[PDB]
Design a protein around this ligand. Structure first.
Ligand SMILES: Nc1ncnc2c1ncn2[C@@H]1O[C@H](COP(=O)(O)OP(=O)(O)O)[C@@H](O)[C@H]1O
Ligand SMILES: Nc1ncnc2c1ncn2[C@@H]1O[C@H](COP(=O)(O)OP(=O)(O)O)[C@@H](O)[C@H]1O
Ligand SMILES: Nc1ncnc2c1ncn2[C@@H]1O[C@H](COP(=O)(O)OP(=O)(O)O)[C@@H](O)[C@H]1O
Ligand SMILES: [Mg+2]
Ligand SMILES: [Mg+2]
Ligand SMILES: [Mg+2]
Ligand SMILES: [Mg+2]
Ligand SMILES: [Mg+2]
Lengths: 525, 538, 211, 106, 526, 49
């Protein structure tokens, strides 16, 4: 080869070898990720080099933790990562469709057909498929029931059935709580916290905040009923000047005077806080809680606790916004002029200590626009799995709200799109009809793999569903319990319209670009 | 014709040292085998007749014990499935305090029976569903097996009787003595408020006199000595400081600027006078014991000796906070004299030597106080550590009893009753889940079987007798270990009782661990790394 | 992982779909190499031995023998082709191509979860029907000189170029007709093949005698 | 034994279980007692232990001799521990304790 | 001992003569053969493996050539000329390499036929001058005001790339970006698209949603959550100095001997920050953007006046924002004049894309800088899209600066070859043979197009050559899709004159450079 | 993403030391170059001079 002639240590695959290598890698990825698809999938154990155990079913997570060093695998992994980052679901279907598209294209390329014709067929079929997807979407008002159905359709695929049943309610309630009318949903305003002391089904939604730290002064109150929340970003600890000053005295009395004087700056701000606390609540019935992003030195902690004030230091940067939205105060960067109107309110603040670490709960807010999800479980890997599941569920609900529509699931849309493409195939002029057929057959992978994972047989189940769809015209999917065709809309199995659209676009683009590659070179050394 | 190449696809894109297992034989059966190996490893240390094990960790520290959680912690377990079972055992230890060996044995039995069920033809989903149904049935049944309640926790005798069963599995020979000690320590703590803190019971290990010489002290003991001439106070008025016992200095930078001779002459005299004034101000408040958390200056020590003040220095801030809780003082951040509402009081503070260790004792006389201390004696450090573990188990049992006062019969009676009821329920259940329910019931026999094996009798005869008596209607009859032949006796009269929460959480965690292990179908292990340990674990 | 590797740690095992993948990949590789051999328009291959001996060939069996291959499935296919060449003497490239395409087509349905046994049953039924059809379609005919010339042309044109094949056709047909006795089996040992290295390739001919 | 593709404990772990383990423990205790056997009574003799740096330690005290022996047998370490304990609590009888314990075991 | 004595140092290999020339020409030919198959509208992509672990799946000639490493110095020369062609005009990179390879191939014949290389070089220079003259002769003018024609030019430029499927959108994006970057100050025309037309790639979405913004978009967020994330008609103030309290340059120390000096110094720090923020507020801005940090107290004093602040913005991003919104970067807010306040931006929206916050200063009126938001399948697809957009923008700039167009699809090559042959017919010296040889060596481009299309090279090229012998046939080339001869007057494939001129010049000068070379010497240190 | 695997099929089954040159450029042109080199080697010894 020319490259090896120039660079002796060059690894090069050319012509049909390039296609063989790429398609083999895609087929390997598809073979591994077949078993993930559907609620009846199989969980995978992932053990890192350090020995960390991570049970998972997510396509993107598994792709990240597969021990793979292949270029085509890297490209597919990047596609899946983009899909997950934007939409949040469909990575397993993404990999499956890419691999099956490549296989179907190879089925004709092996007969001496140039890949360009297949790619033209892919493009025409994708255009028709997008038209059909626009045609088949169900524009429905996103009430609670529909969001619950979407959350089920995601979480049941990710986790156990009962845990999914709990997580649906948690996720849907949280999204509805933080969502304002005709405004984009900010998922940063939902906090996901880890507690490792109860069963997995004890995960619930707290209409407030949970903080992974508590008061550092032992004399502070451990439970405040009616609390005034002060969210501040002011440092309440001694800070040296910026000019490198130092002190100069001549006797012990002068040293004591300078020791007492050097603390006056922080003492004034602590005095302002205490004065506000006295002003707002002259009785001991109410409570005052100070949450600070900057540190608090022990002297300030003692001075504050002597007035019955709960103080938490070094809170998270986003916790400022979260507390502002939930409790309803104003995040102050200075105490230059503070007024009672800058104080948030919480109907209950109490501290939970688990093992060595400490937690603080801020509940019973008036109308929190920022809530938190408390993930509970007996193992670390269980917590990680539940975190991934709730991420998928929140993304699914957010997508369902953002789109005014929703797409029937269970692979029904895939069957309908395949039949529509087959009917449209005569309209395409030339040999691109072969590419259209390849695209339709590739789209048909989802019901095939669903039936395969459910334990039935691919051919018979698929032909039964296709015959039923042709006879009746309804959107019939795969019943994972009996194998019979079922109307996905009637039984409340819903996909995401945006997820399907992104699936079509990304899969077609990456398959088209991979098919046209005719040489892999590694000559940068 | 001479080699079998790796299959095209995933088998060729795998990394160098990575391993991939899939399917029943390669993954599920291997996981079950590893869990069975771990359970068999820890099985021999179960029950009162459990035999201690010497475990040498990678740091060559020697552990002798029969606590399952400790053994699993000190063992370098590498199999991921066994690792998950160990996580379940540790979670049981953290949540309740005792029952880790029960979790291990039950999970192992469940997984072995799952392997049997899979081999006879059942699917993994059916096995998991049957186990879940049976676990729910067991959790429903368990409240009906409660025999008696604690009914009082301020009574020394009853509390010791309750704790005897918990700390007789460990230290079988002498459990009455340790029960009395831990009962005294727990009854001193646990005030009128229902909250009981396990951390308020401290254990001090002093070597030399055999464990029969151990005692409980209503106060705190520190393995150090005083710093001044005064070594004993009878009416202590301790004042506690977190600052060093020295003149406080500027935080920015201190420079003594001298511009004349008089300042140079007078500086040290003024510093000494100021230190003397501060110490005298402290002493005039009535305080005669000063406890500081930092360095002690030489001039400050001189003036403390001058005014007859006992100086004690505590390095650990945890010890400082515990001492403040015990005495009733507040840690002052500056060297100011304490006001009368924050000067702690202790009925006696003195320096004493026990064995050959100097100890400072903050001793009360009332049967009260926030913190109590159990000073252990013995002849070996390892033996005293074992006694400390037993004390920890007893205190955790007391805490559980405060949280929930219900008790279930021990000695395997509860397990046999649960097995019988679950089998009866499964016989009425049609469908393929009846096999899994019956296997879950049968897995409960692993507890009386292990007890009988350890006691040296024939397990089969014991289990047959247990079924016979339970079918007769006696639900409180378990294994009698005080006999050379298989025999049974009533646990309620004998007094072997187990906490309800202990069994509840143990069953829940063991079932969850077994189900989670079963759910795994494929394993992808990365190549092991020989780095300088993960940074997260320090 | 596997039971064999448990018993023998240094054992190579490919189980379940891995076995089919390995075998089908090897068959497809052999088919891809031998595709260009088929027909008179196929390309020539120059095979260089370790000693440096140059051998130009287009025969399927010769190419199979002198490809640097170490695969089990390739070994089975080579044995089948060796038997085919030993008994019939022609059809080795077609043999390899048909085996490879049979395996590829069977995998096309096996990858959809279909059990291989059903495919084999279909193969047997199809083979029976195809044999019946081949019996129907054969052209029984007394073979005079021109038909034999046509058959020899059909073989030699695939093996060598045009004029050389034209010479060899007359040579081989006349030799067979000379040594053949009526209603008796033909002993090919009676046609000695002698090599000389002095004239052009088109000077090869038949001697009504012995050399 | 079987290879067990993924092994349970860390590779290189050593385990001893059963009656042979207990018998070996008793024998190790006997060996440790023998090292201080002759240093008992008005006719007892001294021992000279040289450490790695070359320093010699000549003593009759049982606790001192046991300490200067870098014993690493887990069962034998108990005798050294009880000798140290007797030295701490009482100050004498450090040779008698080891002999008595080893004789009980024997 | 007696270590060996020698003139030059060891490991100093020297070779010379005919075999050096042959090696140089084969190196150039191999470099040509690397990317010969990537030319035309039916080119196949290549998957380059980055040494660091990345992947460059590309079709552009310069990308492929710059991603590989060679040891033969002639190959280094060819890589360098590829980079030169890429930088100077923007595209034509894979054509100049092929042309240089073919020119050296036809020169090797004369080198082996006892011709001194200086004669070949003289013939090459004469031929290059005549090619330049012929290209200037056959070109046609273009009015830059015709938007449709400009779009068609860009289309012909990117029809050979992977973006031809969205060609319409890509052409509109490139044309709009170049038109709005076009700037002129102090009588100095300027189209600086490498600084003021930024391409930002965010994966996900669909490529149909990519568009050019009438403003700048940066991956930033408000420093404090209380600030507005949506302002209708902001007044923007741009700063490149910190809003904190930093140390001075001189070594300064304070000597505190009084009680109140420490607190007074801290209060002076706070007062200085407040005065700085007051000076900023005096202009009544709406958003404040700084390249350096903004202290928490500064954030408070800005929010007290209802101002949004962006903390740390790169220098180039700040320059783009200044061009877009008509602001002027200032350092000391005490000198902040009214004219430095950026008015002209019509919206400042800070939305969320995926899981990150992006700041938009879109909706400007008459902006002189813009950001191209590319949303697509993944990182590699978007990188290829960015490369194609760069090609399109470079072609647009070349046309805008030079409004001349020449026929594409090999028509220019055949026309120039025919004219050169006709001129050589009158030559009588010995230099005519290399003159012709390079003239017909120019015909490699239509041959490569035909080969890549898959049609028959010999008969199509012969028919095209015969067609070009007629009078009004300078615009006859091939179809890269159908593989048939077609008039470029009806196909619409045209390319800038500057691109073709640079291609021919670079190819001929590369041939000249490598023909002069003999006696390779290697191994010596610095 | 740092190594190019051997293509499935014949590329993998080849022995370690073997070489397979196929196609026009990889075989025919290399053969032609080798023959041209040999002819150039022996060219200078042609004729009376
Ligand atoms: N209960 C169900 N019955 C039938 N089909 C289902 C059911 N739940 C999910 N599905 C279908 O199975 C697929 C599950 O894919 P999933 O495992 O979520 O992959 P990803 O997480 O990558 O989207 C979805 O396309 C959905 O339409
Ligand atoms: N005297 C006894 N007779 C019979 N069984 C007993 C007796 N004392 C304790 N047990 C049983 O031993 C078990 C305790 O075993 P143990 O080693 O404590 O395991 P764990 O530490 O995991 O609880 C209890 O289930 C109890 O029923
Ligand atoms: N539709 C077409 N038919 C035939 N030739 C074309 C067509 N479009 C462009 N070309 C030719 O292809 C060449 C551009 O190929 P390209 O890959 O862009 O090369 P470069 O990277 O050197 O610009 C131009 O010389 C042009 O004449
Ligand atoms: Mg999903
Ligand atoms: Mg226990
Ligand atoms: Mg033949
Ligand atoms: Mg003595
Ligand atoms: Mg171009």
């Amino acid at each position: 080869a020319a490259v090896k002639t120039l660079n002796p240590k060059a690894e090069v695959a050319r012509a049909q070898a390039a296609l063989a290598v790429n398609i083999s890698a895609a087929r390997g990825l598809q073979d591994v990720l077949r078993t993930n698809l559907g609620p009846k999938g199989t969980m995978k154990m992932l053990v890192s080099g350090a020995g960390d155990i991570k049970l998972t079913k997510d396509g993107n997570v598994l792709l990240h933790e597969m021990q793979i060093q292949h270029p085509t695998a890297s490209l597919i992994a990047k596609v899946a990562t983009a899909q997950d980052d934007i939409t949040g679901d469909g990575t397993t279907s993404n990999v499956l469709i890419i691999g099956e598209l490549l296989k179907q294209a190879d089925l004709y390329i092996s007969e001496g057909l140039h890949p360009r014709i297949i790619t033209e067929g892919f493009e025409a079929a994708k255009e028709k498929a997008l038209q059909f997807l626009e045609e088949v979407k169900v524009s429905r008002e996103m009430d609670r029931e529909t969001l619950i159905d979407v959350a089920r359709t995601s979480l049941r695929t990710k986790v156990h059935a009962e845990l999914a049943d709990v997580l649906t309610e948690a996720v849907v309630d949280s999204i509805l709580a933080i969502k304002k009318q005709d405004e984009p949903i900010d998922l940063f305003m939902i906090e996901i916290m880890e507690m490792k002391h109860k069963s997995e089904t004890d995960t619930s939604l707290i209409r407030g905040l949970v903080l992974d730290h508590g008061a550092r002064h032992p004399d502070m109150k451990k439970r405040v009923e009616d609390a005034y929340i002060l969210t501040c970003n002011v440092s309440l600890e001694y800070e040296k000047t910026e000019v490198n000053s130092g002190f100069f005295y001549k006797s012990a009395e002068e040293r004591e005077k300078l020791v007492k004087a050097e603390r006056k700056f922080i003492e004034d701000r602590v005095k302002k806080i205490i004065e506000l606390k006295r002003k707002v609540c002259g009785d001991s019935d109410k409570g005052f809680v100070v949450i600070n992003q900057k540190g608090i030195d022990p002297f300030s902690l003692d001075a504050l606790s002597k007035e019955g004030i709960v103080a938490l230091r070094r809170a998270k940067r986003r916790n400022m916004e979260r507390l502002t939205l939930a409790c309803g105060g104003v995040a102050l960067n200075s105490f230059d002029d503070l007024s009672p109107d800058c104080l948030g309110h919480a109907g209950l603040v109490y501290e939970y200590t688990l093992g060595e670490e400490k937690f603080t709960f801020i509940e019973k807010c008036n109308n929190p626009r920022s809530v938190t999800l408390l993930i509970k479980g007996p193992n670390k890997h269980t917590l990680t799995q539940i975190k991934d599941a709730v991420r998928d569920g929140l993304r699914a609900v957010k997508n369902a709200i953002d789109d005014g529509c929703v797409v029937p699931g269970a692979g029904a849309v895939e069957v309908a799109m395949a039949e529509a493409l087959i009917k449209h195939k005569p309209s395409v002029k030339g040999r691109a009809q072969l590419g259209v057929q390849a695209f339709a057959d590739a789209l048909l992978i989802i019901p095939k793999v669903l039936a395969q994972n459910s334990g039935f047989d691919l051919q018979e189940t698929l032909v039964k569903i296709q015959a039923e769809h042709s006879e009746s015209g309804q959107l019939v999917g795969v019943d994972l319990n009996t194998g019979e065709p079922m109307v996905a809309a009637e039984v409340g199995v819903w996909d995401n319209y945006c997820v399907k659209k992104q699936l079509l676009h990304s899969c077609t683009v990456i398959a088209t670009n991979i098919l046209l590659v005719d040489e892999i070179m590694r000559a940068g050394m | 014709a001479l080699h079998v190449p790796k299959a095209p696809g995933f088998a060729q894109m795998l990394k160098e040292g990575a391993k991939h297992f899939s399917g029943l034989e390669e993954a599920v059966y291997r996981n079950i085998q590893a869990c069975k190996e771990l359970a068999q490893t820890t099985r021999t240390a179960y029950g009162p007749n459990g035999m201690n094990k010497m475990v040498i960790n990678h740091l060559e520290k020697l552990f002798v014990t029969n606590d399952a959680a400790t053994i699993l912690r000190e063992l370098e377990v590498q199999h991921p499935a066994a690792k998950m079972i160990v996580m379940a055992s540790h979670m049981q230890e953290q949540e309740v305090g005792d029952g880790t060996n029960f979790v291990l044995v039950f999970a192992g039995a469940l997984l072995e029976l799952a392997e049997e069920l899979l081999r006879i033809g059942l699917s993994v989903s059916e096995v998991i569903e049957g186990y879940e149904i049976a676990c729910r049935k067991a959790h429903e049944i368990l409240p009906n097996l409660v025999c008696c309640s604690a009914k009082n926790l301020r009574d020394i005798d009853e509390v010791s009787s309750l704790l005897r069963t918990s700390i007789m599995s460990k230290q079988y020979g002498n459990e009455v003595f340790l029960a009395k000690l831990i009962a005294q320590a727990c009854v001193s703590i646990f005030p009128d408020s229902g909250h009981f803190n396990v951390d308020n019971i401290r254990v001090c290990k002093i070597l030399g006199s055999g464990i029969s010489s151990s005692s409980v002290l209503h106060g705190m003991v520190f393995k150090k000595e005083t710093e001044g001439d005064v070594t004993s106070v009878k009416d202590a008025k301790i004042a506690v400081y977190s600052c060093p016992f020295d003149g406080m200095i500027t935080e920015t930078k201190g420079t003594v600027l001298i511009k004349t001779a008089e300042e140079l002459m007078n500086f040290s005299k003024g510093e000494e006078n100021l230190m003397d004034a501060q110490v005298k101000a402290i002493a005039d408040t009535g305080a005669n014991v000063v406890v500081t958390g930092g360095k002690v200056a030489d001039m400050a020590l001189h003036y403390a000796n001058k005014y007859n003040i006992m100086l004690v220095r505590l390095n650990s801030k945890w010890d400082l906070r515990r001492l403040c809780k015990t005495v009733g003082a507040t840690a002052l951040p500056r060297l100011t004299p304490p006001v009368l509402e924050e000067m702690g009081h202790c009925d006696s503070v003195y320096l004493s030597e026990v064995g050959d260790t100097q100890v400072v004792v903050f001793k009360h006389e009332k049967e009260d106080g926030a913190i109590s201390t159990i000073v252990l004696r013995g002849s070996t450090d390892n033996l005293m550590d074992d006694i400390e573990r037993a004390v920890d188990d007893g205190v955790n049992t007391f805490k559980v009893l405060t949280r929930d006062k219900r008790l279930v019969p021990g000695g395997g009676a509860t397990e046999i009753e649960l097995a019988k009821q679950i089998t009866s329920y499964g016989e009425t259940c049609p469908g393929l889940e009846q096999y899994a329910i019956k296997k879950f019931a049968e897995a409960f026999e692993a507890i009386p079987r292990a007890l009988a094996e350890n006691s040296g009798v024939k397990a089969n005869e014991v289990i047959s007798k247990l079924y016979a008596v339970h079918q007769e209607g006696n639900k409180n009859v378990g294994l009698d270990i005080e006999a050379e032949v298989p025999a049974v006796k009533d646990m309620l009269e004998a007094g072997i009782l187990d906490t309800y929460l202990g069994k509840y959480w143990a069953i829940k965690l063991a079932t969850n661990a077994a189900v989670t292990v079963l759910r795994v179908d494929q394993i992808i292990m990365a190549k092991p790394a020989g780095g300088p340990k993960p940074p997260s674990g320090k | 992982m596997a039971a064999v590797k448990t018993l023998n740690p240094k054992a190579e095992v490919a189980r379940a779909q891995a076995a089919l993948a390995v075998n089908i990949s090897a068959a497809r590789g052999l088919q891809d190499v031998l595709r260009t051999n088929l027909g008179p328009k196929g390309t020539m291959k120059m095979l260089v031995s370790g000693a440096g001996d140059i051998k130009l060939t287009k025969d399927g069996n010769v190419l199979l023998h002198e490809m640097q291959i170490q695969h089990p499935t390739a070994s089975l296919i080579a044995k089948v082709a060796t038997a085919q060449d030993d008994i019939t003497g022609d059809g080795t490239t077609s043999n390899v191509l048909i085996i490879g395409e049979l395996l590829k087509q069977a995998d096309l349905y096996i990858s959809e979860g279909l059990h291989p046994r059903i495919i084999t049953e279909g193969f047997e039924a199809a083979k029976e029907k195809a044999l019946q059809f081949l019996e129907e379609v054969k052209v029984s005919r007394e073979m005079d000189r021109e038909t034999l010339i046509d058959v020899a042309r059909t073989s030699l044109r695939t093996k060598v170029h045009a004029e050389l094949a034209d010479v060899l056709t007359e040579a081989v047909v006349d030799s067979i007709l000379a040594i053949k006795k009526q209603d008796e089996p033909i002993d090919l040992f009676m046609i000695e093949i002698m090599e000389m290295k002095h004239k052009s390739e088109t000077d090869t001919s038949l001697i009504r005698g012995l050399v | 034994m079987m290879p067990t593709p993924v092994i349970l404990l860390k590779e290189g772990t050593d385990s001893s279980q059963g009656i042979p383990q207990l018998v070996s423990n008793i024998s190790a205790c006997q060996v440790i007692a023998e090292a201080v056997r002759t240093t008992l009574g008005p006719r007892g003799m001294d021992k000279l232990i040289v450490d790695g740096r070359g320093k010699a330690t000549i003593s009759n005290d049982g606790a001192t001799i046991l300490k200067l022996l870098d014993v690493v047998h887990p069962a034998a370490k108990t005798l050294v521990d009880i000798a140290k304990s007797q030295d701490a609590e009482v100050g004498d009888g450090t040779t008698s304790v080891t002999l008595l314990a080893a004789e009980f075991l024997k | 001992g007696h270590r060996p004595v020698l003139v030059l140092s060891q490991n100093t290999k020297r070779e010379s003569g005919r075999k050096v020339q042959s090696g140089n020409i084969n190196a150039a030919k191999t470099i040509a053969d690397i990317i010969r198959t990537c030319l035309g509208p039916k080119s196949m992509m290549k998957m380059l493996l980055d040494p660091m672990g990345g992947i460059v799946m590309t079709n552009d000639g310069n990308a492929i050539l710059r991603e590989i490493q060679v040891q033969h110095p002639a190959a280094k020369s060819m890589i360098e000329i590829s980079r030169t062609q890429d930088e100077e005009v923007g595209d034509g990179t894979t054509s100049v390499i092929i042309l240089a390879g073919e020119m050296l191939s036809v020169a090797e014949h004369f080198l082996e036929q006892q011709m001194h290389p200086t004669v070949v070089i003289s013939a090459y220079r004469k031929a290059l001058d005549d090619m330049i003259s012929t290209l200037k002769k056959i070109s046609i003018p273009v009015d830059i005001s015709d938007s449709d024609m400009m779009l068609n030019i860009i289309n012909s430029s990117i029809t050979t790339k992977a973006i031809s499927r969205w060609s319409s959108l890509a052409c509109n994006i490139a044309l709009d970006a170049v038109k709005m970057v076009q700037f002129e100050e102090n009588g100095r025309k300027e189209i600086d698209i490498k600084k003021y037309a930024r391409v930002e790639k965010i994966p996900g979405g669909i490529i149909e949603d990519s568009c050019v913004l009438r403003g700048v978009m940066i991956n930033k967020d408000v420093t404090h959550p209380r600030m507005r994330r949506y302002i209708k008609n902001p007044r923007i103030v741009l700063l490149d100095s910190s809003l904190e309290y930093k140390k001075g340059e001189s070594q300064t120390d304070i000597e505190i001997t009084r009680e109140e000096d420490f607190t007074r110094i801290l209060q002076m720090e706070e007062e200085y920050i407040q005065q700085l923020c007051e000076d900023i507020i005096q202009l009544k801005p709406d958003v404040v953007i700084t390249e350096k940090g903004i202290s928490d107290l500064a954030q408070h004093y800005l929010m007290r006046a209802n101002i949004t602040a962006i903390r740390r913005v790169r220098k180039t991003d700040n320059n783009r924002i200044a061009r877009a919104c008509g602001a002027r970067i200032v350092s000391r807010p005490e000198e902040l004049r009214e004219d430095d306040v950026g008015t002209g931006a019509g919206l400042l929206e800070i939305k969320k894309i995926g899981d990150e916050y992006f700041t938009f200063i879109t909706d400007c009126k008459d902006p002189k800088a813009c950001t191209i938001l590319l949303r697509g399948a993944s990182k590699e697809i978007l990188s290829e899209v960015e490369r194609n957009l760069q090609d399109a923008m470079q072609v647009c700039r070349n046309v805008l600066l030079d409004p001349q167009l020449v026929p594409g699809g090999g028509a220019s090559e055949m026309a120039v070859a025919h004219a050169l042959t006709e001129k050589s017919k009158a030559m009588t010296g010995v230099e005519q043979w290399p003159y012709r040889a390079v003239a017909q060596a120019l015909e490699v481009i239509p041959r490569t197009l035909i080969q890549n299309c898959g049609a028959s090279t010999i008969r199509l090229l012969t028919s095209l050559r015969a067609k070009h012998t007629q009078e009004n046939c300078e615009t006859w080339g091939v179809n890269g899709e159908t593989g048939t001869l077609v008039d470029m007057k009806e196909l619409g494939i045209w390319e800038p004159l500057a691109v073709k001129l640079q291609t021919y010049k670079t190819a001929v000068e590369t041939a000249v450079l490598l023909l002069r070379i003999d006696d390779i010497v290697s191994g010596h240190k610095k």
